[PDB]
Design an enzyme around this catalytic site. Structure first.
Site, PDB file in Angstrom:
ATOM      1  N   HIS A   1    -111.409 -47.606 -50.049  1.00  9.81           N
ATOM      2  CA  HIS A   1    -110.003 -47.197 -50.005  1.00  9.81           C
ATOM      3  C   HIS A   1    -109.429 -46.933 -51.390  1.00  9.81           C
ATOM      4  CE1 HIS A   1    -110.381 -48.818 -45.937  1.00  9.81           C
ATOM      5  NE2 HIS A   1    -110.727 -49.979 -46.462  1.00  9.81           N
TER       6      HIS A   1
ATOM      7  N   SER B   1    -112.990 -42.440 -50.854  1.00 12.44           N
ATOM      8  CA  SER B   1    -112.407 -43.454 -49.984  1.00 12.44           C
ATOM      9  C   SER B   1    -113.299 -43.683 -48.764  1.00 12.44           C
ATOM     10  CB  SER B   1    -111.003 -43.037 -49.534  1.00 12.44           C
ATOM     11  OG  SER B   1    -110.388 -44.046 -48.737  1.00 12.44           O
TER      12      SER B   1
ATOM     13  N   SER C   1    -106.389 -44.053 -45.867  1.00 10.78           N
ATOM     14  CA  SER C   1    -106.123 -45.211 -46.712  1.00 10.78           C
ATOM     15  C   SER C   1    -105.854 -44.871 -48.171  1.00 10.78           C
ATOM     16  CB  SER C   1    -107.290 -46.200 -46.641  1.00 10.78           C
ATOM     17  OG  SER C   1    -108.504 -45.612 -47.085  1.00 10.78           O
TER      18      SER C   1
ATOM     19  N   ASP D   1    -117.699 -50.094 -48.756  1.00 13.36           N
ATOM     20  CA  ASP D   1    -116.763 -50.812 -47.890  1.00 13.36           C
ATOM     21  C   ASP D   1    -116.888 -50.209 -46.495  1.00 13.36           C
ATOM     22  OD1 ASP D   1    -114.605 -51.900 -46.462  1.00 13.36           O
ATOM     23  OD2 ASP D   1    -113.345 -52.029 -48.246  1.00 13.36           O
TER      24      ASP D   1
ATOM     25  N   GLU E   1    -118.311 -54.749 -49.250  1.00 15.02           N
ATOM     26  CA  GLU E   1    -116.997 -55.395 -49.274  1.00 15.02           C
ATOM     27  C   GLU E   1    -116.631 -56.131 -47.984  1.00 15.02           C
ATOM     28  OE1 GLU E   1    -114.852 -55.616 -51.803  1.00 15.02           O
ATOM     29  OE2 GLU E   1    -112.838 -55.877 -50.989  1.00 15.02           O
TER      30      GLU E   1
ATOM     31  N   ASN F   1    -118.196 -60.062 -48.954  1.00 17.05           N
ATOM     32  CA  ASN F   1    -117.185 -60.489 -47.993  1.00 17.05           C
ATOM     33  C   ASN F   1    -117.111 -62.008 -47.878  1.00 17.05           C
ATOM     34  OD1 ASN F   1    -115.267 -59.605 -45.644  1.00 17.05           O
ATOM     35  ND2 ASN F   1    -116.661 -61.084 -44.678  1.00 17.05           N
TER      36      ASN F   1
ATOM     37  N   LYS G   1    -112.865 -64.134 -51.163  1.00 16.21           N
ATOM     38  CA  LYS G   1    -112.731 -62.869 -50.462  1.00 16.21           C
ATOM     39  C   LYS G   1    -112.316 -63.155 -49.022  1.00 16.21           C
ATOM     40  CE  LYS G   1    -113.321 -58.673 -48.793  1.00 16.21           C
ATOM     41  NZ  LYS G   1    -113.200 -58.335 -47.340  1.00 16.21           N
TER      42      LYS G   1
ATOM     43  N   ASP H   1    -108.534 -62.282 -48.868  1.00 16.27           N
ATOM     44  CA  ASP H   1    -108.407 -60.894 -48.430  1.00 16.27           C
ATOM     45  C   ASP H   1    -108.229 -60.787 -46.914  1.00 16.27           C
ATOM     46  OD1 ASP H   1    -109.400 -58.288 -47.396  1.00 16.27           O
ATOM     47  OD2 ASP H   1    -109.925 -57.856 -49.485  1.00 16.27           O
ATOM     48  N   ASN H   2    -109.239 -61.224 -46.151  1.00 15.59           N
ATOM     49  CA  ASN H   2    -109.273 -60.942 -44.716  1.00 15.59           C
ATOM     50  C   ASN H   2    -108.112 -61.600 -43.978  1.00 15.59           C
ATOM     51  OD1 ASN H   2    -111.775 -60.339 -45.904  1.00 15.59           O
ATOM     52  ND2 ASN H   2    -112.862 -60.558 -43.951  1.00 15.59           N
TER      53      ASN H   2
ATOM     54  N   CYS I   1    -104.013 -59.591 -44.473  1.00 16.98           N
ATOM     55  CA  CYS I   1    -103.473 -59.074 -43.223  1.00 16.98           C
ATOM     56  C   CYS I   1    -102.137 -59.722 -42.872  1.00 16.98           C
ATOM     57  CB  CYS I   1    -104.491 -59.277 -42.101  1.00 16.98           C
ATOM     58  SG  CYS I   1    -105.955 -58.203 -42.274  1.00 16.98           S
TER      59      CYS I   1
ATOM     60  N   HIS J   1    -112.009 -52.434 -38.917  1.00 17.75           N
ATOM     61  CA  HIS J   1    -112.438 -51.402 -39.862  1.00 17.75           C
ATOM     62  C   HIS J   1    -112.535 -50.011 -39.229  1.00 17.75           C
ATOM     63  CE1 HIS J   1    -114.348 -49.844 -43.519  1.00 17.75           C
ATOM     64  NE2 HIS J   1    -115.150 -49.180 -42.705  1.00 17.75           N
TER      65      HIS J   1
ATOM     66  N   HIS K   1    -103.614 -54.509 -48.567  1.00 23.15           N
ATOM     67  CA  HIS K   1    -103.355 -55.802 -49.180  1.00 23.15           C
ATOM     68  C   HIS K   1    -102.695 -55.625 -50.548  1.00 23.15           C
ATOM     69  CE1 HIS K   1    -105.678 -56.930 -45.875  1.00 23.15           C
ATOM     70  NE2 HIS K   1    -106.800 -57.324 -46.451  1.00 23.15           N
TER      71      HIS K   1
ATOM     72  N   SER L   1    -111.022 -60.348 -54.233  1.00 15.00           N
ATOM     73  CA  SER L   1    -112.112 -59.542 -53.691  1.00 15.00           C
ATOM     74  C   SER L   1    -112.798 -58.724 -54.776  1.00 15.00           C
ATOM     75  CB  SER L   1    -111.589 -58.608 -52.599  1.00 15.00           C
ATOM     76  OG  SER L   1    -110.803 -59.304 -51.657  1.00 15.00           O
TER      77      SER L   1
ATOM     78  N   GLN M   1    -116.451 -58.308 -56.597  1.00 19.12           N
ATOM     79  CA  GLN M   1    -117.192 -57.049 -56.674  1.00 19.12           C
ATOM     80  C   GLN M   1    -117.773 -56.825 -58.067  1.00 19.12           C
ATOM     81  OE1 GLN M   1    -118.485 -54.850 -54.898  1.00 19.12           O
ATOM     82  NE2 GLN M   1    -117.495 -54.851 -52.872  1.00 19.12           N
TER      83      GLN M   1
HETATM   84  N1  LIG Z   1    -107.826 -53.841 -42.459  1.00 14.47           N
HETATM   85  C1  LIG Z   1    -108.114 -54.766 -43.369  1.00 14.47           C
HETATM   86  O1  LIG Z   1    -107.437 -54.923 -44.404  1.00 14.47           O
HETATM   87  C2  LIG Z   1    -109.354 -55.590 -43.166  1.00 14.47           C
HETATM   88  C3  LIG Z   1    -109.668 -56.650 -44.009  1.00 14.47           C
HETATM   89  C4  LIG Z   1    -110.825 -57.382 -43.801  1.00 14.47           C
HETATM   90  C5  LIG Z   1    -111.649 -57.055 -42.753  1.00 14.47           C
HETATM   91  N2  LIG Z   1    -111.318 -56.039 -41.931  1.00 14.47           N
HETATM   92  C6  LIG Z   1    -112.159 -55.684 -40.750  1.00 14.47           C
HETATM   93  O2  LIG Z   1    -111.616 -56.306 -39.617  1.00 14.47           O
HETATM   94  C7  LIG Z   1    -112.680 -56.656 -38.699  1.00 14.47           C
HETATM   95  C8  LIG Z   1    -112.653 -58.141 -38.425  1.00 14.47           C
HETATM   96  O3  LIG Z   1    -113.071 -58.861 -39.607  1.00 14.47           O
HETATM   97  P1  LIG Z   1    -113.096 -60.453 -39.644  1.00 14.47           P
HETATM   98  O4  LIG Z   1    -113.387 -60.897 -41.025  1.00 14.47           O
HETATM   99  O5  LIG Z   1    -111.886 -60.972 -38.967  1.00 14.47           O
HETATM  100  O6  LIG Z   1    -114.352 -60.789 -38.714  1.00 14.47           O
HETATM  101  P2  LIG Z   1    -114.594 -62.054 -37.776  1.00 14.47           P
HETATM  102  O7  LIG Z   1    -116.011 -62.126 -37.346  1.00 14.47           O
HETATM  103  O8  LIG Z   1    -114.206 -63.275 -38.606  1.00 14.47           O
HETATM  104  O9  LIG Z   1    -113.541 -61.934 -36.556  1.00 14.47           O
HETATM  105  C9  LIG Z   1    -113.724 -61.068 -35.418  1.00 14.47           C
HETATM  106  C10 LIG Z   1    -113.414 -61.904 -34.208  1.00 14.47           C
HETATM  107  O10 LIG Z   1    -113.254 -61.070 -33.041  1.00 14.47           O
HETATM  108  C11 LIG Z   1    -113.725 -61.794 -31.929  1.00 14.47           C
HETATM  109  N3  LIG Z   1    -114.008 -60.856 -30.850  1.00 14.47           N
HETATM  110  C12 LIG Z   1    -115.105 -60.047 -30.709  1.00 14.47           C
HETATM  111  N4  LIG Z   1    -115.097 -59.310 -29.624  1.00 14.47           N
HETATM  112  C13 LIG Z   1    -113.905 -59.660 -29.001  1.00 14.47           C
HETATM  113  C14 LIG Z   1    -113.310 -59.254 -27.791  1.00 14.47           C
HETATM  114  N5  LIG Z   1    -113.854 -58.372 -26.947  1.00 14.47           N
HETATM  115  N6  LIG Z   1    -112.123 -59.807 -27.458  1.00 14.47           N
HETATM  116  C15 LIG Z   1    -111.577 -60.703 -28.286  1.00 14.47           C
HETATM  117  N7  LIG Z   1    -112.045 -61.165 -29.449  1.00 14.47           N
HETATM  118  C16 LIG Z   1    -113.222 -60.605 -29.751  1.00 14.47           C
HETATM  119  C17 LIG Z   1    -114.937 -62.563 -32.447  1.00 14.47           C
HETATM  120  O11 LIG Z   1    -115.176 -63.711 -31.649  1.00 14.47           O
HETATM  121  C18 LIG Z   1    -114.485 -62.946 -33.865  1.00 14.47           C
HETATM  122  O12 LIG Z   1    -113.949 -64.264 -33.956  1.00 14.47           O
HETATM  123  C19 LIG Z   1    -113.963 -56.124 -39.336  1.00 14.47           C
HETATM  124  O13 LIG Z   1    -114.198 -54.794 -38.880  1.00 14.47           O
HETATM  125  C20 LIG Z   1    -113.614 -56.140 -40.824  1.00 14.47           C
HETATM  126  O14 LIG Z   1    -114.445 -55.250 -41.559  1.00 14.47           O
HETATM  127  C21 LIG Z   1    -110.201 -55.309 -42.112  1.00 14.47           C
HETATM  128  K   LIG Z   2    -101.116 -52.583 -51.931  1.00 18.98           K
END
Ligand SMILES: NC(=O)c1ccc[n+]([C@@H]2O[C@H](COP(=O)([O-])OP(=O)(O)OC[C@H]3O[C@@H](n4cnc5c(N)ncnc54)[C@H](O)[C@@H]3O)[C@@H](O)[C@H]2O)c1
Ligand SMILES: [K+]
Ligand SMILES: NC(=O)c1ccc[n+]([C@@H]2O[C@H](COP(=O)([O-])OP(=O)(O)OC[C@H]3O[C@@H](n4cnc5c(N)ncnc54)[C@H](O)[C@@H]3O)[C@@H](O)[C@H]2O)c1
Ligand SMILES: NC(=O)c1ccc[n+]([C@@H]2O[C@H](COP(=O)([O-])OP(=O)(O)OC[C@H]3O[C@@H](n4cnc5c(N)ncnc54)[C@H](O)[C@@H]3O)[C@@H](O)[C@H]2O)c1
Ligand SMILES: NC(=O)c1ccc[n+]([C@@H]2O[C@H](COP(=O)([O-])OP(=O)(O)OC[C@H]3O[C@@H](n4cnc5c(N)ncnc54)[C@H](O)[C@@H]3O)[C@@H](O)[C@H]2O)c1
Ligand SMILES: Nc1ncnc2[nH]cnc12
Ligand SMILES: Nc1ncnc2[nH]cnc12
Ligand SMILES: [K+]
Ligand SMILES: [K+]
Ligand SMILES: [K+]
Lengths: 461, 462, 462, 463
Positions: D55, D78, D83, D133, D158, D183, D188, D192-193, D197, D317, D376, D384, D388
């Site tokens: 991004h 990106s 993004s 990423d 990432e 990650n 991180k 971050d995660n 959010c 993602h 973020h 994060s 990296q």
């Molecule tokens: N947008 C952002 O800023 C950002 C930041 C970090 C990660 N992400 C992305 O977000 C996603 C989640 O990352 P994470 O770190 O939370 O992973 P994670 O493994 O910690 O969490 C995902 C959760 O979803 C649950 N799940 C799976 N299938 C499901 C379903 N059908 N119904 C309900 N729950 C279900 C799993 O049990 C798990 O606990 C990934 O794709 C990651 O790359 C996005």
């Molecule tokens: K920002």
């Protein structure tokens, strides 16, 4: 040999004194009143009939009244709310008090009568301090002649004020009264933050139930309902709120609660069909906070989820239809002020029956019944207002006024905002807070004195 | 087309604004409920309203409700940065005279209010006033007092404007009656508090994209705006300190879990640098003023703030912060519109990589409207339903046509009856899907109220 | 009929304790689901378990679950103040050997453990150990090593106990395998965190009835216990500051909205009074130790604390606070059991109205159990379901019957498999009425798991 | 500089604005800037040639210029079509750094941008490092340019979804170079995660719709790190939040955190039929947010049952968490403004402008925090991206591509950074808040069995 009292156990006095000394350090507004008015003795000659929960907090209030010159005779305003070590300490000080935890209804009435009568004749009382209106009602209905010597009533709580206002509207109120409840340092401190502190306190002591993750229904969202909802929400309960007042309901929505009714579309027609059984079947805990009658009725009690807890934190127990439960369901005491109510019937119970409810304090005020009510630093605000109210009405001497001058003063009023602010400032200092002083230009700009009051009487905070 | 009686930033944003207006209408049940209820009756037939309030999407729905009930209007914004240009464009494109754009100068701000007052170089035949802050009210009383002879009332939105009305009332200089819309519970306890809860952190994020969790904030004031502002920051994880002059509000800040501090040692603001608690101010990452007072974030406080702290105001006027001192002594660097770095190393020029600077939002103007979009539609629903009810009541009263003795009895500043406050609230609650319970006749008698309400005495503070 | 092999405060509390056990059973679905699932299989038939853990109502349900699965037990509490006398009474009345009461002396504490190890003056033929904190494990290894030759395993409840086990393992002094129950997610991130969230403010209220909203707290440590404790206080409206030695944990405290501070200037504990941030400690109304470390609220800190501050510990052992310094130097006034005012004016006497004192709770022992009832049943449900699974597994492995060459290969400290951790969590979620969603085969395929779980790699931290 | 044209951005004149915001962002990223200052003199990445795909925000700008400050050359794109912050991309291009990124790419333009990093003057660039990423660059390299992987020393990935893809390739023997899992550093994943959010989810919803959130009903799908932070973003605003999960441990946490745990399907059983949808439940939901990293967790039948005018968004993602393909095929799309669409459920061909039966979709299903806001904040991305940088230095210095085959076999893995570096990043973050960390006494460090310097926890610790 002081004998003009009755308590549970006088040997608890030393323990009570220890907790009173701690409480004084938690009540700077009230103790500050002792230092400010000590030399002046503004309650010299005052003879106060007092009826309010005989807690350690009330103990500091009583001794503050005495330190300013008053004589008192005291009872509790609830059968379960007395702290026996507080009653004992007060009796040991040579102060007439008739109160204990676990009175019967007969003993409750007898305790009020002991404050009214000294040596079989009416005491020569001239002031009344009341919480809920029970002592006020007995005086007006059974000893109306005594009221001809009484300069005023200082009433503590919302239910008591409503009763005073009905009498005023009906021309049956004999003496002036001060609505202590509606000081901001009372209603918006005691009723709200006090219940926030003490509701989950009482449920924990009674049941030791985990509250996080469970579903609760709070009936009412006034000051008590707001604080009760927060008590549960901050513990992690999923809290739903019921209301008849759309403005209070609006606040619940904005505060993050879902607003629901026990009855389908909110219409209470008295039938089982009107009950939202799916909603009630999910509720782990119900708390009534209304000051109204039968807001947790028999049909709601039948529909509640098995093993839900039922309690009331409003002033009177008629918020919950406990009469229905006494008639039809078997009561198993777990411990004092904790009963399982077996919905399988009255003909005994299976000790392993899963279909029961847990009622706290038999529907009486649960924070005082199953714990100790509000903490000292909150009651500091309420009871500082009480001392000021007593001084205000006593110094007016309504009972000595010519008749042609009484009508102007026969009223129910709140304390002026300047007193409200004075109490608030001592509370803030108790927390170590620093209030900023306006400059003359700032005061002029917003049109107030640098001394206050800082808000108009219309202001709601 | 043919219609040139307006001035907006860009009329071609009208379709976009109309799209957001249609969305907002579904978020404003109380306001659209009044639209349906009174559409047939046309209770504002004959009303000619001068309106001066933030030209937002929410104000657009207010404006079109008034027109839908029969009113004609001429509108301007009550702040130079608060207009949403797509909202103004949709209103002008609807044939409604509006003079407002985001980023006016002070001269342009005054000119816009004058274009509502004047039509074709002469005073419009106005007979109703809707104001937010009192600027329009003040201009009519000082510069066009003859117009007030034909005006039936003023409906004033906000705390600062109500204060100005009450001073005029006491002095005997207020020419027409007013409704204090601010002090409806569905306004003051909704708009002023919950609105700022939503939009304060909203504006700070849009302007700076700063993380707020774990940082130190100081909120000046703990009235309704200060209460909502403190919650806006605290729910994000800020460590929030609160300053107050009102000990009752201060008591509330303590019970709500905040530390109550003063920028001045022992609270004594004696105007010297030595009075500043430099230790406290050197730890603050974010200061927000919420008071409606003057110079509550003064020059000595600004000199004492931690490097790179954010400074903003969410009260009505910008003089809560001494930005005049900053314009006089420090160099201003525009990050982007309504975001300036103020370099405390001197007045002329600045190092692009200087670290001793403050970030001022909206040049001290109301930050929620200046750097974001103000309160959300579902909150402004309550304020603006009160405004419509208020306009209806004062237009039907016809003050300007009443005999002198009647005028004297009705020349006042008043709030709407509690029953109407409750009816607005009930539509808001239904908007959330909430279900309000109906009292039984026995329950209503027990607490001494009608089953229909009102449910509380007028003394009740909620 | 004539059961005397027990020592409790008051056997007549038995009926009361049984009433509360029946309630607790309805609050512990995971543990009662184990009782029902395994009752007919009797997987602990032949097990003889020495148990040392807080003799609470919750431990009662654990004890009777093990007995229901076939085991014999002999029980003691692992803390002198943590027993609930009505729970001890009910367990004794059921004919189960238990030696426990609230308010034991240190000498009585050791004696109670020995009464479990010895039956009729001789070593009981134990073959399983359940421990909380490692006191029983230490007494066995040091004083009864011959008994360990017949013992198949230890299941250890808490963080401090696990650390003591791992120290023995690396020193080659651990004699039997152990299961680390603490580090199941349904234990560590349930019990240690959420349990203290519930019971910390609970105990302070019972001991002092102090208002907490608006006052200043300092929590030492921000591991699982420190996380839960800080929330227990912040949700009540306290202004909470956090101390840590672990920068990652300190990072979380910042992001969770807490100010991270140190009792010592620049964090440097050089042992002198000069290192104390006296300004900070003079503002603190409440300090809570959560570390499992030694002397983290030391004598110089206790001297600098604000008058009438509350001092308590919620880690396993009382040596987090230098209570010995206070016994040596200051005068103790008992307010009521497990609540002492400690008068900093001198050792000999005290003035009953002296204002310079501290309130110590539970004499520095685990405060949630000393001044209240510890964690609630529905939280302890997860911990104790893990204990039952751990006991079954180690008993069925029969370590003590292996040749020396095989013992050496299996001597270790392990955790339960994630599939079992998940199954305990499912029963907990069902107890709340929660509904877990089931993956479709293609969803399971997409993220690389089985439909039934496990759902996370072993590296997952939750 | 003069002559530089090896980039593609929306509007190069945005560079001065972007530079102003990068200068602010540096003051918000002490861990990353401390690494820039620490390693500047040494130039640990001299000779590094890094293909970067993440991004193109202001925060990525600071990461890019840190890498260049340590000696690297980079070519950037990106990893999502919505993004990029165009002023960030402009500032980077104006610095003479090749970047191919703008907000609002088509799928064709997106893939074109990755190829422009891979190819320089029509031939494969002699790249030797990868920062990714999501795994899209990694996938293109392994599938389309495998010969380039013979010169690359490692990948630093990432996010959760990218790491899962890497572990799948390792399990099948198809991974050609080693990787660091960035990650799962605690600074991180658990910063971050989750906290990122929390900051940016309600940020993006307000910018897109300006809806009041307080008092409304939300359904969050998933309670991992992103779902935990997303649920707090909504609950702290006063929403009534319900949580769906397939993992009962995460579900347990949701309950204990004060949320009601529910399923879109009756008894949690998703058999594909309309009858299985809890229509009463979904008929009350004002906002649904997907957070899972899984496929089709907000399906067509759920979308048909949602309350009228509900908001639908994804913060995982990839956009396939929501069945947007069904909506494109059956319902008419009305753009409110960029990245905000009303989806009219009354039919495909045309819509009534005053129709009330619509849903509001954000960012066309793409990660909503970056699509409708700025992702973020800098002070969170600090952690994060410090990770990296450390990860890049480690893999570049290991020089995998230069090792004999037997030494490569020992190194072909997916690893995380050591806890000691995790701790050193966290420490700089804490100092950025003014936090003061306490130092153990020798006796205390011995009591708990750690060094005074750390690491302070065993590798098993979950925080
Ligand atoms: N947008 C952002 O800023 C950002 C930041 C970090 C990660 N992400 C992305 O977000 C996603 C989640 O990352 P994470 O770190 O939370 O992973 P994670 O493994 O910690 O969490 C995902 C959760 O979803 C649950 N799940 C799976 N299938 C499901 C379903 N059908 N119904 C309900 N729950 C279900 C799993 O049990 C798990 O606990 C990934 O794709 C990651 O790359 C996005
Ligand atoms: K920002
Ligand atoms: N236990 C305590 O410590 C304590 C403290 C203060 C007051 N009280 C008592 O609590 C009661 C409430 O006091 P308050 O100050 O909150 O009064 P309040 O008037 O502020 O609030 C009561 C609320 O109940 C609502 N209500 C009435 N009937 C209802 C019904 N059938 N269903 C739902 N909502 C209904 C009303 O709309 C109102 O908002 C009084 O009896 C008061 O004396 C108890
Ligand atoms: N931006 C918005 O969306 C918005 C919304 C509503 C009102 N307002 C404006 O915000 C301002 C505040 O409105 P309100 O309704 O909260 O008024 P309020 O009277 O309820 O609160 C103002 C508070 O400021 C305090 N105060 C005054 N001088 C102070 C000083 N020097 N230091 C500390 N505290 C001081 C007062 O004690 C008072 O409690 C007004 O100008 C109002 O018009 C803005
Ligand atoms: N009372 C209860 O109900 C209960 C429940 C579970 C655990 N415990 C006990 O509580 C203690 C902590 O358990 P845990 O699981 O949270 O452990 P933990 O390892 O997760 O956390 C302890 C924390 O203390 C920090 N710390 C160590 N020395 C410090 C110092 N000098 N200053 C500040 N911080 C310091 C460490 O960095 C660590 O983060 C243990 O003794 C455990 O047995 C008690
Ligand atoms: N502790 C207390 N004492 C007296 N009255 C009270 N009302 C509520 N709590 C109380
Ligand atoms: N209630 C309880 N019973 C047993 N062990 C505990 N540890 C913490 N709380 C406990
Ligand atoms: K109390
Ligand atoms: K808005
Ligand atoms: K318990």
């Amino acid at each position: 040999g002081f004998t003009d009292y009755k308590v549970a156990d006088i040997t608890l006095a030393a323990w009570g004194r220890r907790e009173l000394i701690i409480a004084e350090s938690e009540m700077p507004a009230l103790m500050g009143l002792r230092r400010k008015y000590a030399g002046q003795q503004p309650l010299k000659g005052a003879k106060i009939l007092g009826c309010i929960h005989m807690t350690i907090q009330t103990g500091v209030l009583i001794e503050t009244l005495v330190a300013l010159g008053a004589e008192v005779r005291w009872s509790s305003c609830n059968i379960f709310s007395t702290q026996d070590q507080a009653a004992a300490a007060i009796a040991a000080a040579g102060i007439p008090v008739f109160a204990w935890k676990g009175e019967t209804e007969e003993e409750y009435e007898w305790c009020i009568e002991q404050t009214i009568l000294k040596d079989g004749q009416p005491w020569d009382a001239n002031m009344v301090l009341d919480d809920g209106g029970d002592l006020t009602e007995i005086l007006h209905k059974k000893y109306p002649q005594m009221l001809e010597r009484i300069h005023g009533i200082t009433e503590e709580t919302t239910t008591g004020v409503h009763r005073l206002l009905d009498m005023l509207k009906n021309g049956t109120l004999k003496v002036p009264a001060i609505n202590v409840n509606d000081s901001v340092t009372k209603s918006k401190n005691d009723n709200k933050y006090g219940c926030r502190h003490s509701l989950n306190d009482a449920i924990k002591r009674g049941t030791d139930h985990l509250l996080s993750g469970k579903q609760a229904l709070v009936i009412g969202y006034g000051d008590v309902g707001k604080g009760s909802s927060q008590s549960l929400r901050q513990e992690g309960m999923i809290v739903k709120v019921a209301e008849v007042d759309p403005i209070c309901a609006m606040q619940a929505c904005m505060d993050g609660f879902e607003v629901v009714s026990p009855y389908k579309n909110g219409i209470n027609d008295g039938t089982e069909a009107s009950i939202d059984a799916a909603l009630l079947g999910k509720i782990d805990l119900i708390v009534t906070t209304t000051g109204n009658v039968n807001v947790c009725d028999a049909n709601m009690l039948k529909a509640l989820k098995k093993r839900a807890v039922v309690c009331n934190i409003g002033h009177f127990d008629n918020e919950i239809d406990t009469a229905f439960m006494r008639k039809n369901w078997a009561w198993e005491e777990v411990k004092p002020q904790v009963h399982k109510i077996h919905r399988t019937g009255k003909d005994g119970f299976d000790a392993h029956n899963d279909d029961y409810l847990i009622l706290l304090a038999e529907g009486r005020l649960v924070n005082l019944g199953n714990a100790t009510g509000h903490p000292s630093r909150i009651m500091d605000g309420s009871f500082a207002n009480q001392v000021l109210a007593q001084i205000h009405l006593f110094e007016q001497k309504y009972a000595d006024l010519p008749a042609a001058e009484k009508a102007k003063r026969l009223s129910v009023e709140v304390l002026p905002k300047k007193l409200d602010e004075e109490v608030a400032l001592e509370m803030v200092k108790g927390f170590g807070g620093v209030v900023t002083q306006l400059t003359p230009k700032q005061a002029e700009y917003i049109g107030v004195s640098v001394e206050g009051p800082f808000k108009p009487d219309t202001y709601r905070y």
